[PDB]
Design a protein around this ligand. Structure first.
Ligand SMILES: Cc1noc(C)c1-c1ccc(C(=O)N2[C@@H](c3ccccc3Cl)SC[C@H]2C(=O)O)cc1
Ligand SMILES: Cc1nc(N2C[C@@H](C)O[C@@H](C)C2)c2[nH]c(N)c(S(=O)(=O)c3ccccc3F)c2n1
Lengths: 224, 259, 341, 230, 55
C-alpha cells in the first residue's frame, strides 16, 4: 500500500520524531528563569551574578543548567507577549532599595518604588502566572543602608511606624510585596535581600528553584 | 449464605459499585497523561496500578456469587484475584519509591526522568505476581479452593508462608522505609508553608496506613495459618479488605488531587 | 499652532465620519437577508499532527495546499505533509520565542520571527539537503508579530514597534517602512493581488498600507481592544479583524466602514486567529475558550463549534483550495479539520 | 557535493575487497545511499542500498546475502563489503545519493565511479541507439511490465543521461518533474505503461546513453539504455 | 512636534479624499462573490469522500 520512498518518507519522519523527542527531553531537563527587572533596578547587576530583545543567559550550578531570559530590553506592550513565558519554573523579579525616596524621572509624580510595586502587582496575580513562583530580589541594599538614616521612609510609606533602623524598615519592604500576591494557595514568593558583592545570589536561586522542582514532582506523584 | 456470608456479599457489592466508575475515570485520566509528552515513571506505575485494580474488580462478581457454582472458572478467578492483589502491592511499593526519589532527590529526578524505569518497575511487579501465581497453579494442577486434605494443606501452608514473605514483606518494608524518609524530608526541609506540606504528609500517611491496613489481614492470615496448621476462616474478610483497597485507590491517587 | 492642528484633526475625523454615514445605505444584514443559511457545518479531525513538544503560536499552509509549517516555543519549525502526517523538515530555530511563521509562494523559503526581533529566512530547496538560514533580517526594535511573503525576494513583516516594513532577501535592508500606528501591530494579511496589505494593531485600528507607494491609504476603527488577528477577503475588496472584545468585524475596502460584527452573548473570550474560506462565506475564527466557532460571513450566525483542543487556538489557516482548515493550538497538536460529505 | 570512491582494482575470483565511498559537501547523515554497477558495454544494475540512520537494508536478488553495505556518518563515508567475487561482478560501480521526502529528487547526484576488473519489473527500451541531429526533436520511449502509477498519483520514473567519460546525471524524476540544473529542453510524460522523453533541440551535451529506471518496487531494475549519436 | 502633528493631520488628507462608494453597492459585491464560488468552495458544500484528500 506504501511505495518504495513512501515507506522511506515514513522512515525519515521517524528519525525526525526521534530527534524532537530527544531534544524535547533535554529541554525538559532545563530551568527557565524569566527576569522581569524594573527601571534601572535589576537585570543589569544580577545577570552577571549568575555567571536586542531576548538575551538568554545560561549558567550551570550544581549540575543544573539554568536559562535566564532578560526581557527588560523590550519596551513593547507586556501583556501581548507575556504568555510566551507561561510555564517558566520561576520569575526572578528585582526591585531596587534606593528607589524608596527617589522619584521617577520620567513621571515626576510618583516615586520609582511604587512603579515597581505596580509592575509587581500585575505580574504577581497575572492569569498565566498563577502557578509559577517569584524569586523577589532586593538589590543595591548597601545604598539603602545609609539612605534610610538620612532620608526617612515616610516619603514613600508615611504609615511606617518605625525608627531609622534598617532591619525595621526593610521588614516592612518585605511585607509590602507579599500582600500583592492574591493566589496564595498556588504560589509562594521567596523574597531575599541581597547586596552587590555577595556571591550567594546563585545559591538562593537554586534553592528557590529546587522548591519549585519539588512542587512539580509532587503534582506528578499525585500528592500536593 | 447468612450473617457473615451476607455481610461479606454486601461488602463486595458496595465495594464493586463504589470502585468501578472511579476506576474508569482514573484509567481515562492516566491514559490521557501517558499520551501527553514527557511522562514520569510514577504516571506509568499509576496506570499499571489502575489496570491491575480494574482487573481485580472485573473478577469480583465471581466472588460475590460465591458469597451466597461454575468449575475451573472458580480456579482462574482466584488466580486473577490473588495475582492482581499482589501486583497492586508491588505497584504501591513502586509508587512509594517514586515519591521518595522525587521528593528526596529533586534535581536528579528532573535530570533523569526516563519512563523506562517505570516501565520495568511495572514489568517487575507484574512478573513477580503473575509468574508466581502461574507456577504455583501449574504445580497444583500438575468449594472453589476452600477445603484441603492433610497432605494438601501440608503443601499449601509452607507455600503460603514463602509466597507471603516474598510478595508482601519486601514491598511492605520498602514502602514503609520510603514513606518514612519522605515524611522526614517533608517536615525537615525549608519549603512552602504548612498549607502544602501538611496536605502532602497527610496523604502519604493515609496511603501508608491504607496499604498496611488492607494488605495486613490477608498476609498475617498466611502466618497464623502456617503456625496453627489450619486455614484462617477470616480469609474472606481479609480479601474483602484487599478489594476495598483496590476500590478506594482511585479516590486516594486521582480524586484526592482535584479535590 | 498645535491647538489649530489638533482642532483640524478633529474636524477631519468628523468629515470622514459624515462621509461614512452618508455612504452607509444599509447594513449587510438587511440587504443579505433573503439568502439561506449555510447550515450546521460539522467538522471532523481528519488528521491529528502530533510532533510538537510545546505551545504552538503560528502555522501557515503552502501554495500546494499540502505542506504546512508550524512554529512552536520548543524551538522547531516543523514542515509537515498534511496528507500523510509526515514531517518533511524539522528546522531548529536559534531563538525559541517564535510567534510567527510563513511559507513562500514558490515554496522554497520559510520565515520565522518572534521576541528575538529578527526575521530568519530559511532555504528549503538546497543542494546540501539540510535547511539553512538564508538571511537574518534585523532592524526592528520591537517584538515581531507577523511576517508574510510577498514573493521569493520581498517579505512584509509587522512588529511591535507600531510599524510594518518591507524587506529584500538578497540585500537585507528595509526597502520600505510603514509607520503611523499608535500601538503594537499584531498581525498583517497580504492581499491576493500582492499590491496592498492591511494590518491590525493594539490601538483597535486597522490601516490599509500600499507596498508600491509606502504610505497608509485608509484607516479602519470600531474595535474596543487590541486587534489580535486579521484576514483578507478572497475577492480582495474586504477584510475581517479579530480582537480581544470577542466581536470579530468585517470591513469593506471600497466602503471604508465596518459592515458586520460577529459577537455572541456566551462568547467573551478574545480572538486569536481569523481566516476566511475559498468563497468568502465561511469565516473561521479561533477563540480563547478552546473553540473555533464558525461564523457565517454574510449572516453573523454561528454554524460550528470545532471544540477539540485542550488549550487556546493560537493559529488557524484555510488552504488555497479550501479542502482543509488547520487549527493548530497551544496543546502542541495541530488538527486538520475537514467537512465530511 | 563530492563523492570520491576507492577500493577498486584487479581481484582474483572468490576474493574479498571493501569499497569505500567518501561523502563531502552535503549532509551525509540525512541522505540515503545507493550502489549502482555498470558492466562494460551493458546497462546499469542496482546492487545495494542503505537508509538514513542505517534503518532498512536491501540487496539485489543476484547479490542478496553475498554482499553487505554499511555507513559511518562520523567519518561521512560509505562502505560496501564484497565477498566471494565472481566473474560477473565486474562493473563500473557508482556511489549514488538519494533523499526521500515529499517533492524530493532521489538519485540526484552520482559519484565518480570505481571499476573492479576481476516478479521483478522488466524495463525494455525499443532501440539501443537513435541517430540525432542538432535542432531536431527526439522522443526516447521505454516499456514497463506493470503499471508504475501508484494510488498516490505518481509515475515512478527516473531518467538518467550518461555522457561518455562521465557519471550518469538525473534528468527527470517522477516522469514529470525536471531535476535541478537540467535544461528545460528535456521533457517527459505518459501513463503507467506508455513512456516517453520528449527532448527538444539537441545540443553537444545531449550525447550519451539514456536510461529509464523504475522505482515502484525496490529491486530497481534499470532500462536497457538508448544511445544518442551525434 | 508641530511638524509631527502636521504629518498626523496630513495623514487624513488623502483618507478623506477617498471616493467612498455606497455600502449597498459594496454589499452587492460580497454576496455575489459567495454564490458565484459557492459550488467551487469545498468547505460550504462538502466534496464526496472519493475526491477528499483527507480520508
Ligand atoms: C502447589 C500446590 N499443590 O497443591 C496445591 C493445592 C497447591 C497450591 C495452590 C495454590 C496455592 C496458593 O496458596 N495461592 C495461589 C492460588 C490459589 C488459588 C487459586 C489460584 C492460585 Cl494461583 S495464588 C496465591 C495463593 C493464594 O491462595 O493466595 C498454594 C498451593
Ligand atoms: C537507578 C534507578 N532505578 C529506579 N528504579 C526504582 C523502581 C521504580 O523500579 C526499579 C526497577 C528501579 C528508579 N526510579 C526512579 N524514579 C529513578 S530516578 O529517575 O528518580 C533517578 C535516576 C538516577 C539517579 C537518581 C534518581 F533518583 C530511578 N533510578
Amino acid at each position: 500500500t506504501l511505495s518504495a520512498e513512501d515507506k522511506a518518507a515514513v522512515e525519515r519522519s521517524k528519525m525526525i520524531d526521534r530527534n524532537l523527542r530527544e531534544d524535547g527531553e533535554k529541554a525538559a531537563r532545563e530551568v527557565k528563569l524569566l527576569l522581569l527587572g524594573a527601571g534601572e533596578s535589576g537585570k543589569n547587576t544580577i545577570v552577571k551574578q549568575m555567571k536586542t530583545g531576548i538575551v538568554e543567559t545560561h549558567f550551570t550550578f550544581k549540575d543544573l543548567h539554568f536559562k535566564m531570559f532578560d526581557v527588560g530590553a523590550q519596551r513593547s506592550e507586556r501583556k501581548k507577549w507575556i504568555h510566551c513565558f507561561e510555564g517558566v519554573t520561576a520569575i526572578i523579579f528585582c526591585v531596587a532599595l534606593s528607589d524608596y525616596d527617589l522619584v521617577l524621572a520620567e513621571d515626576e509624580e510618583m516615586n520609582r518604588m511604587h512603579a515597581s510595586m505596580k509592575l509587581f502587582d500585575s505580574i504577581c496575580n497575572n492569569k498565566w502566572f498563577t502557578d509559577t513562583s517569584i524569586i523577589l530580589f532586593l538589590n543595591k541594599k548597601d545604598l539603602f543602608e545609609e539612605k534610610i538614616k538620612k532620608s526617612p521612609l515616610t516619603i514613600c510609606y508615611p504609615e511606617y511606624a518605625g525608627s531609622n533602623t534598617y532591619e525595621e524598615a526593610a521588614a516592612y519592604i518585605q511585607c509590602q510585596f507579599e500582600d500583592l500576591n492574591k493566589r496564595k494557595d498556588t504560589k509562594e514568593i521567596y523574597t531575599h535581600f541581597t547586596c552587590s558583592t555577595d556571591t550567594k545570589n546563585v545559591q538562593f536561586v537554586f534553592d528557590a528553584v529546587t522548591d519549585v522542582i519539588i512542587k512539580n514532582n509532587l503534582k506528578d506523584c499525585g500528592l500536593f | 449464605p447468612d450473617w457473615k456470608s451476607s455481610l461479606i456479599l454486601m461488602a463486595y457489592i458496595i465495594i464493586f459499585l463504589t470502585g468501578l466508575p472511579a476506576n474508569l475515570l482514573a484509567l481515562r485520566a492516566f491514559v490521557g497523561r501517558i499520551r501527553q509528552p514527557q511522562p514520569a515513571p510514577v504516571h506509568i506505575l499509576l496506570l499499571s496500578l489502575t489496570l491491575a485494580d480494574l482487573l481485580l474488580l472485573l473478577l469480583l462478581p465471581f466472588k460475590i456469587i460465591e458469597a451466597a457454582l461454575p468449575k475451573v472458572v472458580c480456579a482462574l478467578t482466584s488466580f486473577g484475584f490473588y495475582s492482581s492483589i499482589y501486583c497492586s502491592t508491588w505497584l504501591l511499593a513502586g509508587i512509594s519509591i517514586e515519591r521518595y526519589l522525587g521528593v528526596a532527590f529533586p534535581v536528579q529526578y528532573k535530570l533523569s526522568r526516563r519512563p523506562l524505569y517505570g516501565v520495568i518497575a511495572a514489568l517487575v511487579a507484574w512478573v513477580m505476581s503473575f509468574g508466581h501465581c502461574t507456577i504455583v497453579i501449574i504445580v497444583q494442577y500438575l468449594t472453589c479452593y476452600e477445603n484441603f486434605t492433610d497432605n494438601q494443606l501440608d503443601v499449601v501452608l509452607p507455600v503460603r508462608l514463602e509466597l507471603c514473605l516474598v510478595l508482601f514483606f519486601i514491598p511492605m518494608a520498602v514502602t514503609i522505609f520510603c514513606y518514612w524518609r519522605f515524611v522526614w524530608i517533608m517536615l525537615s526541609q525549608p519549603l512552602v508553608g504548612a498549607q502544602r506540606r501538611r496536605r502532602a504528609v497527610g496523604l502519604a500517611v493515609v496511603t501508608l496506613l491504607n496499604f498496611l491496613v488492607c494488605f495486613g489481614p490477608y498476609n498475617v492470615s498466611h502466618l497464623v495459618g502456617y503456625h496453627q496448621r489450619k486455614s484462617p476462616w477470616w480469609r474472606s474478610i481479609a480479601v474483602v479488605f484487599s478489594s476495598l483497597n483496590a476500590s478506594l485507590d482511585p479516590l486516594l491517587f486521582y480524586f484526592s488531587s482535584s479535590v | 499652532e498645535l491647538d489649530q492642528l489638533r482642532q483640524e484633526a478633529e474636524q477631519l475625523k468628523n468629515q470622514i465620519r459624515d462621509a461614512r454615514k452618508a455612504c452607509a445605505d444599509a447594513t449587510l444584514s438587511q440587504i443579505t437577508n433573503n439568502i439561506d443559511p449555510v447550515g450546521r457545518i460539522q467538522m471532523r479531525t481528519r488528521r491529528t499532527l502530533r510532533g510538537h513538544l510545546a505551545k504552538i503560536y503560528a502555522m501557515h499552509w503552502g501554495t500546494d495546499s499540502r505542506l504546512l509549517v508550524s512554529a512552536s516555543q520548543d524551538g522547531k519549525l516543523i514542515i509537515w505533509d498534511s496528507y500523510t502526517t509526515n514531517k518533511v523538515h524539522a528546522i531548529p530555530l536559534r531563538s525559541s520565542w517564535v510567534m510567527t511563521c510563513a511559507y513562500a509562494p514558490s515554496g522554497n523559503y520559510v520565515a520565522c520571527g518572534g521576541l528575538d526581533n529578527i526575521c530568519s529566512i530559511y532555504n528549503l530547496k538546497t543542494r546540501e539537503g539540510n535547511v539553512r538560514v538564508s538571511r537574518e533580517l534585523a532592524g526592528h526594535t520591537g517584538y515581531l508579530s507577523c511576517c508574510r511573503f510577498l514573493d521569493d525576494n520581498q517579505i512584509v513583516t509587522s512588529s511591535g514597534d507600531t510599524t510594518c516594513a518591507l524587506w529584500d532577501i538578497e540585500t537585507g535592508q528595509q526597502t520600505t517602512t510603514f509607520t503611523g500606528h499608535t500601538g503594537d501591530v499584531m498581525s498583517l494579511s497580504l492581499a491576493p493581488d500582492t499590491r496592498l496589505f492591511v494590518s491590525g494593531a493594539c490601538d483597535a485600528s486597522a490601516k490599509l498600507w500600499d507596498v508600491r507607494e509606502g504610505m497608509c491609504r485608509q484607516t479602519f476603527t470600531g474595535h474596543e481592544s487590541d486587534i489580535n488577528a486579521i484576514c483578507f477577503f478572497p475577492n480582495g475588496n474586504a477584510f475581517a479583524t479579530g480582537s480581544d472584545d470577542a466581536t470579530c468585524r468585517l470591513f469593506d475596502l471600497r466602503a471604508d466602514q465596518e459592515l458586520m460584527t460577529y459577537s455572541h452573548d456566551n462568547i467573551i473570550c478574545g480572538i486569536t486567529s481569523v481566516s476566511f474560506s475559498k468563497s468568502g462565506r465561511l469565516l473561521l475564527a479561533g477563540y480563547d475558550d478552546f473553540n473555533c466557532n464558525v461564523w457565517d460571513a454574510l449572516k453573523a450566525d454561528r454554524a460550528g463549534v470545532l471544540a477539540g483542543h485542550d488549550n487556546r487556538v493560537s493559529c488557524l489557516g484555510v488552504t488555497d483550495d479550501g479542502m482543509a482548515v488547520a487549527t493548530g493550538s497551544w496543546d502542541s497538536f495541530l488538527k486538520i479539520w475537514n467537512g465530511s460529505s | 557535493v563530492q563523492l570520491v570512491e576507492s577500493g577498486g582494482g584487479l581481484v582474483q575470483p572468490g576474493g574479498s575487497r571493501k569499497l569505500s565511498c567518501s561523502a563531502s559537501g552535503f549532509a551525509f547523515s540525512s541522505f540515503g545511499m545507493h550502489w549502482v554497477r555498470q558492466a562494460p558495454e551493458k546497462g546499469l544494475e542496482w546492487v545495494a542500498y542503505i537508509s538514513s540512520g542505517s534503518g532498512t537494508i536491501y540487496y539485489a536478488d543476484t547479490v542478496k546475502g553475498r554482499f553487505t553495505i554499511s555507513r559511518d556518518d562520523p567519518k561521512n563515508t560509505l562502505f560496501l563489503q564484497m565477498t566471494s567475487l565472481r566473474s560477473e561482478d565486474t562493473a563500473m560501480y557508482y556511489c549514488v545519493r538519494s533523499i526521500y521526502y515529499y517533492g524530493s529528487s532521489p538519485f540526484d547526484f552520482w559519484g565518480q565511479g570505481t571499476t573492479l576488473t576481476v516478479a521483478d519489473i522488466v524495463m525494455t527500451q525499443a532501440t539501443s541507439s537513435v541517430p540525432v541531429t542538432p535542432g531536431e526533436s527526439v522522443s526516447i520511449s521505454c516499456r514497463s511490465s506493470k503499471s508504475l502509477l501508484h494510488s498516490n498519483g505518481n509515475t515512478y520514473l527516473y531518467w538518467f543521461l550518461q555522457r561518455p567519460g562521465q557519471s550518469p546525471q538525473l534528468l527527470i524524476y517522477r516522469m514529470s518533474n525536471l531535476a535541478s540544473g537540467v535544461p528545460d529542453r528535456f521533457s517527459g510524460s505518459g501513463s503507467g505503461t506508455a513512456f516517453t522523453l520528449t527532448i527538444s533541440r539537441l545540443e553537444a551535451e545531449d550525447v550519451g546513453v539514456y536510461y529509464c529506471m523504475q522505482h515502484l518496487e525496490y529491486p530497481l531494475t534499470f532500462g536497457a539504455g538508448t544511445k544518442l549519436e551525434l | 512636534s508641530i511638524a509631527q502633528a502636521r504629518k498626523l493631520v496630513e495623514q487624513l488628507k488623502m483618507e478623506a479624499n477617498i471616493d467612498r462608494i455606497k455600502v449597498s453597492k459594496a454589499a452587492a459585491d460580497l454576496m455575489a462573490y459567495c454564490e458565484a464560488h459557492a459550488k467551487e468552495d469545498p468547505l460550504l458544500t462538502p466534496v464526496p469522500a472519493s475526491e477528499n484528500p483527507f480520508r
